[PDB]
Design an enzyme around this catalytic site. Structure first.
Site, PDB file in Angstrom:
ATOM      1  N   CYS D 119      40.949  15.716 -26.752  1.00 44.32           N
ATOM      2  CA  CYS D 119      41.746  16.847 -26.308  1.00 44.32           C
ATOM      3  C   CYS D 119      41.104  17.501 -25.095  1.00 44.32           C
ATOM      4  CB  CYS D 119      41.957  17.848 -27.440  1.00 44.32           C
ATOM      5  SG  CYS D 119      43.185  19.102 -27.213  1.00 44.32           S
ATOM      6  N   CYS D 121      41.161  21.336 -24.879  1.00 42.70           N
ATOM      7  CA  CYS D 121      40.940  22.745 -25.166  1.00 42.70           C
ATOM      8  C   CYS D 121      39.495  23.159 -25.032  1.00 42.70           C
ATOM      9  CB  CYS D 121      41.464  23.111 -26.564  1.00 42.70           C
ATOM     10  SG  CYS D 121      40.895  22.099 -27.925  1.00 42.70           S
ATOM     11  N   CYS D 129      45.049  22.940 -24.818  1.00 39.47           N
ATOM     12  CA  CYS D 129      44.905  21.555 -25.181  1.00 39.47           C
ATOM     13  C   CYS D 129      45.433  20.610 -24.134  1.00 39.47           C
ATOM     14  CB  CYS D 129      45.576  21.294 -26.546  1.00 39.47           C
ATOM     15  SG  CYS D 129      44.493  22.015 -27.832  1.00 39.47           S
ATOM     16  N   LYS D 194      49.968  18.143 -36.833  1.00 43.83           N
ATOM     17  CA  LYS D 194      49.003  19.246 -36.613  1.00 43.83           C
ATOM     18  C   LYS D 194      49.797  20.516 -36.393  1.00 43.83           C
ATOM     19  CE  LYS D 194      45.232  20.596 -33.592  1.00 43.83           C
ATOM     20  NZ  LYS D 194      43.925  20.025 -33.148  1.00 43.83           N
ATOM     21  N   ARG D 204      37.507  28.071 -32.880  1.00 44.12           N
ATOM     22  CA  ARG D 204      37.447  28.594 -31.535  1.00 44.12           C
ATOM     23  C   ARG D 204      36.055  29.087 -31.205  1.00 44.12           C
ATOM     24  NH1 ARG D 204      43.544  30.004 -32.040  1.00 44.12           N
ATOM     25  NH2 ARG D 204      44.177  27.808 -32.091  1.00 44.12           N
ATOM     26  N   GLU D 231      56.967  13.950 -37.330  1.00 43.35           N
ATOM     27  CA  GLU D 231      55.881  13.931 -36.368  1.00 43.35           C
ATOM     28  C   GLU D 231      54.927  12.789 -36.602  1.00 43.35           C
ATOM     29  OE1 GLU D 231      54.544  15.117 -33.810  1.00 43.35           O
ATOM     30  OE2 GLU D 231      55.976  16.596 -33.195  1.00 43.35           O
ATOM     31  N   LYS D 246      47.050  18.210 -40.538  1.00 40.88           N
ATOM     32  CA  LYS D 246      46.004  19.231 -40.285  1.00 40.88           C
ATOM     33  C   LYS D 246      46.754  20.547 -40.001  1.00 40.88           C
ATOM     34  CE  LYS D 246      42.774  20.752 -36.691  1.00 40.88           C
ATOM     35  NZ  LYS D 246      42.108  20.366 -35.458  1.00 40.88           N
ATOM     36  N   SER D 272      38.495  24.677 -40.268  1.00 44.27           N
ATOM     37  CA  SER D 272      37.447  25.665 -40.229  1.00 44.27           C
ATOM     38  C   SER D 272      37.767  26.906 -41.036  1.00 44.27           C
ATOM     39  CB  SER D 272      37.133  26.031 -38.778  1.00 44.27           C
ATOM     40  OG  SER D 272      38.303  26.510 -38.152  1.00 44.27           O
TER      41      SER D 272
HETATM   42 ZN   LIG Z   1      42.800  20.855 -28.298  1.00 38.74          ZN
HETATM   43 ZN   LIG Z   2      53.424  14.157 -32.244  1.00 35.19          ZN
END
Ligand SMILES: [Zn+2]
Ligand SMILES: [Zn+2]
Ligand SMILES: [Zn+2]
Ligand SMILES: [Zn+2]
Ligand SMILES: [Zn+2]
Ligand SMILES: [Zn+2]
Ligand SMILES: [Zn+2]
Ligand SMILES: [Zn+2]
Ligand SMILES: [Zn+2]
Ligand SMILES: [Zn+2]
Ligand SMILES: [Zn+2]
Ligand SMILES: [Zn+2]
Ligand SMILES: [Zn+2]
Ligand SMILES: [Zn+2]
Ligand SMILES: [Zn+2]
Ligand SMILES: [Zn+2]
Ligand SMILES: [Zn+2]
Ligand SMILES: [Zn+2]
Lengths: 323, 323, 323, 323, 323, 323
Positions: D119, D121, D129, D194, D204, D231, D246, D272
């Protein structure tokens, strides 16, 4: 364009659409509800149901014969009582209106499939579908009465006893009563899934129920699809011969799901409100009555209903629109 | 009586029915169809749709803002053309009515979810949903036009291009055109399952389609449940973002079966005829409008629809009946 | 890139996400568990459940009214006993705490849907969910007591008797007792699937159960998904009006599978440990409380729960976060 | 009592519960996420994740070896960048942090299954992201970058490229890039489903993402169960080797439904926030950490997950709680 | 006896059986196969198919008009060739018998739905359903010819091209050819599932196929139910508009399973042997012809067929047995 | 052509078709119905069933032995009575024809699986399948008689009692009677799904039923597929050992659906009319008898039948066509 799949190919002409039409509609799918008022001379018009009349009991043998002649296979009788009381006891009198409607219909046209609406809303002082107690409409006291009514209705000639009171265990109660009374052959057309619908307005004016309040404590919530299926399955478990979804028009998803959940026949009621919505819009010229009725009815058949209770039945029969 | 199962126990009071109510209805489920007429000064009343007005394009930014203010999340725009031609070419002009409705709506209320009805029936001389040839309404020539229209509508601000012409491959055609034109982010609200229904009477008077004849060669047979599901699945295969069943009211079984056959969102259209049947019966006092509307809409949600296109949306919003 | 399918198109803005949001959450989905301690003057804070208080029985009519005023539809009562014994007999005394909580709640707010937690862990000396014998917690002796408790609770006003003792045949036992006692209308909110979870820590401090040991011989194994479904189905077979999965948070797969296996309503319990995990992390600033609660609750609704028992209910109601 | 069915019979003792326990949990189900910060000397404590440290890149070979020694089979690497830019270009530099984490892990412990979080982010100035444009986070520009990153990560030794940017077509994009680059054997651990969850707070602070705003335009709505399944299925269609849900903890119903919809492996991320909710409640003494963790993890396995990403993994391994 | 369930209650009379009859049969379900012989003056009787005649091409416009007049919606044309050759090339000549049958039918009765049987067994010297090579009946060479035939048949007016040669990829081949030739609107009535049945005896004498040997290398094994479903599904994948099971009579299980596996229309062929078994037994007085035919046909509809190809069609139409 | 899938590859030769043949047929699947006439010297030919003879009871031990010798595993006995009466009481006489057929068969060939057809149509004056009352064929009076007959048949040696009277509760009634009479080991081969078929013509002449009218009030409607499945499932619920669909030939869809709805064995009856349709067409040279029979029978096995009642059984056995 490069489209291998073109559904429009089978919609090209009327012949092709007829060959491919997946659903059929005929007089064998309809049940005519009929309203009979005792002790009256003239037909009464039900204003909220344009074209619908209350039949005076004295013209009943004539109407039933007319109904039979049109090719109508069966009727659902509804009475307008001049003998109501706290419990709708006329409903169970050997010669109460309920019995007489049935008896008149069956003696006049013996092959007519008579279904007796089995409830008390049209015979009680308070207008509720049963025995009124301080807790509300007592389930069990009502069941006993339904059973008594069923026996007199069956004794009178009804082929189907159709409990529409929305009471728990009503099919079981009525089956035991019929069996014990020796009417093991009498069927039960349960109004298995009957919602506390706002589409029954017109009916109240047609059938005369005196109810000031609602039936939400017995008729189920229109929004409850899972409960609606369970309602009907409990009825199958209690032995109903045919199940039913009412109203039908705004409940075709329920009709379809029930159809996939039982092998029993399924009736579907195109309620008074449905009939009124079509009549009034048609009267205003907003829609074509005949097309809307047939689509409406065909939709109910598409959803999986084996039988439809429709107030349009006689007119469709007489006008030869369905055969 | 000995009944261990008593469904009536959870219907005892309003609180219990609310706790157990299986379906919800809110403004997040509604899409307001809006009728905009270009080149007119005053709102025009659609007689067959009591309470429904044609919005003059010049009052459009005011109406949309009103619509937005009521909490309405999205609208479906429908134009009344003063520039029709054999092919409804205004529909694809950068500044044709289609584009302007979209542009006006989105500039005035940028967070408004604008859906553009994508068809030609309102812009063609003959009133058909596309290009008229000697074979009838040419599928492929129509697809090209739909695609062109989609790009100008998207360019103008439409969030969803909503093809309602019932042409084969229309989602694919429009998706390619949007993508090629650089509008990959523009969605497609397909009118995936659209029947050749008799419930569209009022619409013709509202939207101005000049059609003298029928659309049975493109809109599918109301009786065809299997075809109806296949119609929408082909649309999912072509990439539609949302599918739709139209009409919705007499097609709740289709809505339910489609809901069990796809993970895509499903829209359901409460057509003009449905809206008219309710208004006219309510006007005649045969039914309670507010109750029937909510039951009607709740039924559509019960069947599985994520979104409902209803002409009652603004009124329900403004009267605070739904939030 | 050439991507015909782009799910991100319906996530573009808040309006679009709201139109497409598949699950809703409202006060109609919540049940407030309440802790009432008899014979105390001041509210007691449950340290392991920040923000949660034990209500002194004397402030109960005030709290219930407060609860009702916030829009809360129903509560689950839990008592903190000052009269425990080897069998938790106060639970079945006509005027034991169980009855009084119910009676106070229903007399103060008659439309309040009162659910009575039906168990003995809070009334026994040993702290177990029933009658303690040398074999452990005797199933059948407990069933008899549950039944006795149910009748006094129902007699006192409880709308639902909610057995949480995890005993085999508890729904059947309690249904027979209610029926025989004449409370055929009293419902049963079974804690049908209740695991021997480690998420109940806080509860022990809140409700006062004296248990030194575990409940693994009655509460089922957290790992057992097939058994978990069977547990609830047996309960449906015994007549429960509503089933339940507890805990709910780490058991959403069970909630979903059960939802696909029954038409009965399904409750889901967001246990004390769940409530504590959120409060403590939020207190440490690791997460946003309001967002986590709503997501947590929305997740439980997404999984298929019709009702959720949450200690956050009143706060969400009062803060107007849900309506 | 007369109960033929007694589920409590198999809960009698620990031996019986172990024989009948339907779900297992072991080190073979865990993936350790690891946080590596470049250009730092000392381990940094992530306050919102008690017990979790940012590993200085210079101690990385030591940690990985420690991780390997404990029996941990695989890790998910997360970097804390000291070279961010508008596009997170370090992520695709042959020797950017992403590559180095992978390279260090694989050279130090060649049998270690290295998954690279893929990613931007953690490498972008804006913290999103991906590539930030005026339309928001550009899907397609991000895909190209993901692909570039995947090749350098794979070139560096990563066994799995794990796209967590929630971009449409990310698996397809990354697969093409790996294949073209000659890394046909490099797997893809998609973060297929996600959600735009509120359970990522702690992350974060751990990973350093600079985002001021939200990711709702790419991460999907927590409430969307149908979309969530779609998805992941699109991801299977694009060739992912393993799918993933997730967060996992409040999404076990999604995990279960996906498990019944694909034969592909399914990973589940105990985010987290989940880890923090447990740590903080355990720190407050409200719950037993070890029991809650194992139940939490066992629940994720019960739901159908083949792999779980958990920050507790190393501790469970080292303490020998799982083997 | 104590029987709550009594299915005999709805079998009591003809009216009740009609109300409950689950399947309907009408002229909209029938397709008339017709045999046309070129270059002949008199009708020829097909001895093995009592009542069936070969129509001289010169009487064709008269017969088709007769057929149309009876209410028959569509026909399947079969030619008896006086121009056979090693490859059945007349089948693809612009003016071969195939084209002329179609052209004559459509010009004479434009609304007649013409289906052209598409094969070569009636035009080849060897009598096989295609091109004969040393390997047997070459699949691919046949496909090319089928395609050529389809274009001339479509050019001639056929609404459906009906490949009955049992060649692999025949629907795909014919669809490409029609599309390329500009007949995108021409449908394909595939003989998707056609077994190497022993029920085709009579046909050979009716249609004139010269085959000395069998068709087991192309027509599938009568015993293969899984293959039979796959055969038709491949056809749906290749774009067929309608699928078909042939024979139908002894394959109703295949018809039913296919009906549950596709949303496409399904045709069912009541082969010559079926027609002969009924005629001959009826001629011997062993059965009642009319009852057996209707039951036979009704059974095919019960199994799920939307259309039935029956040689009895015209007779049922003319005698007014079906409408 | 480019076709990756070529089903014709496994149809290339006889060896390949045999390897891939999905269904088998053997003598283990057949049951021979046998007709025995008492008090007669010579075999009588059943004209409507070419090749079928009525066996004089005096030649019965010889025939059964012949039947056994051919490898036939079981027979269904049918008697031609010279002692009929209003109730078919000979059927229940300890030494009535029913008993004697059974006794003779079992004493002569003890390993022969004897199934006794259990009905009254062959023993009643009126020819109906039971006791004739003014309401028609009384269900319950018939049940009692069936039960009596079952006990004498079982006492006589029948392995299966096979009720073919189509009465409601017949399996339950007969099971109770056998059990009470001490024949708990006697099986029940129910004619669970028996339609009011027109394919029974020949039978009447073979078995001698005197019926002038029809059996539509007991035998179910040929068109009713849902009822047909329910009919058999009720039979499974009443304890039948094996279920059956009759007729079988035109009801293979019912056979297939029932096969997917029960784990019980399923018998299928190739009725007299089926046998006659084949014989007569074969006699006329329209079809090949042996091929049609085997395909017919193989089709019934393909549909899912474990056993087939076929009048061809002995001939196939003797000619060694099946083993
Ligand atoms: Zn990300
Ligand atoms: Zn997707
Ligand atoms: Zn009077
Ligand atoms: Zn009533
Ligand atoms: Zn009910
Ligand atoms: Zn102008
Ligand atoms: Zn249009
Ligand atoms: Zn379409
Ligand atoms: Zn005290
Ligand atoms: Zn307890
Ligand atoms: Zn239990
Ligand atoms: Zn640096
Ligand atoms: Zn010639
Ligand atoms: Zn051929
Ligand atoms: Zn094929
Ligand atoms: Zn004698
Ligand atoms: Zn019989
Ligand atoms: Zn039966």
């Amino acid at each position: 364009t490069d489209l291998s799949q073109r559904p429009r190919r089978l919609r090209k002409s009327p012949a092709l659409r007829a060959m491919f039409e997946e659903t059929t509609l005929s007089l064998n799918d309809l049940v005519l509800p009929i309203f009979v008022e005792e002790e009256i001379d003239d037909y009464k018009a039900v204003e909220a149901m344009p074209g619908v009349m209350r039949i005076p009991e004295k013209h009943l043998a004539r109407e039933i014969e007319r109904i039979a002649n049109a090719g109508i296979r069966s009727v659902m009788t509804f009475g307008i009582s001049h003998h109501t009381d706290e419990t709708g006891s006329d409903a169970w009198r050997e010669d109460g209106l309920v019995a007489r409607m049935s008896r008149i219909c069956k003696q006049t046209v013996p092959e007519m499939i008579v279904m007796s609406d089995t409830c008390f809303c049209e015979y009680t002082s308070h207008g509720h579908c049963g025995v009124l107690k301080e807790h509300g409409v007592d389930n069990d006291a009502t069941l006993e009465n339904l059973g008594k009514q069923a026996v007199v209705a069956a004794a009178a000639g009804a082929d189907f006893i159709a409990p529409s009171a929305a009471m728990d265990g009503q099919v079981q109660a009525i089956r035991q009563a019929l069996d014990a009374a020796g009417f093991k052959d009498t069927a039960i057309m349960s109004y298995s899934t009957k919602f506390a619908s706002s589409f029954y307005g017109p009916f109240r004016e047609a059938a005369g129920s005196a109810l000031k309040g609602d039936r939400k404590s017995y008729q189920m919530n229109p929004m409850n699809r899972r409960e609606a299926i369970r309602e009907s399955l409990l009825d199958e478990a209690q032995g109903a011969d045919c199940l039913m979804v009412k109203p039908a028009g705004a409940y075709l998803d329920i009709v379809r799901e029930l159809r996939e959940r039982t092998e029993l026949p399924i009736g579907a009621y195109q309620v008074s409100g449905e009939y009124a919505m079509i009549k009034f819009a048609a009267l205003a010229g907003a829609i074509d009555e005949e097309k809307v009725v047939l689509e409406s009815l065909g939709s109910i058949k598409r959803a999986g209903a084996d039988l439809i209770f429709s107030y349009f039945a006689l007119d469709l029969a007489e006008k030869k629109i369905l055969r």
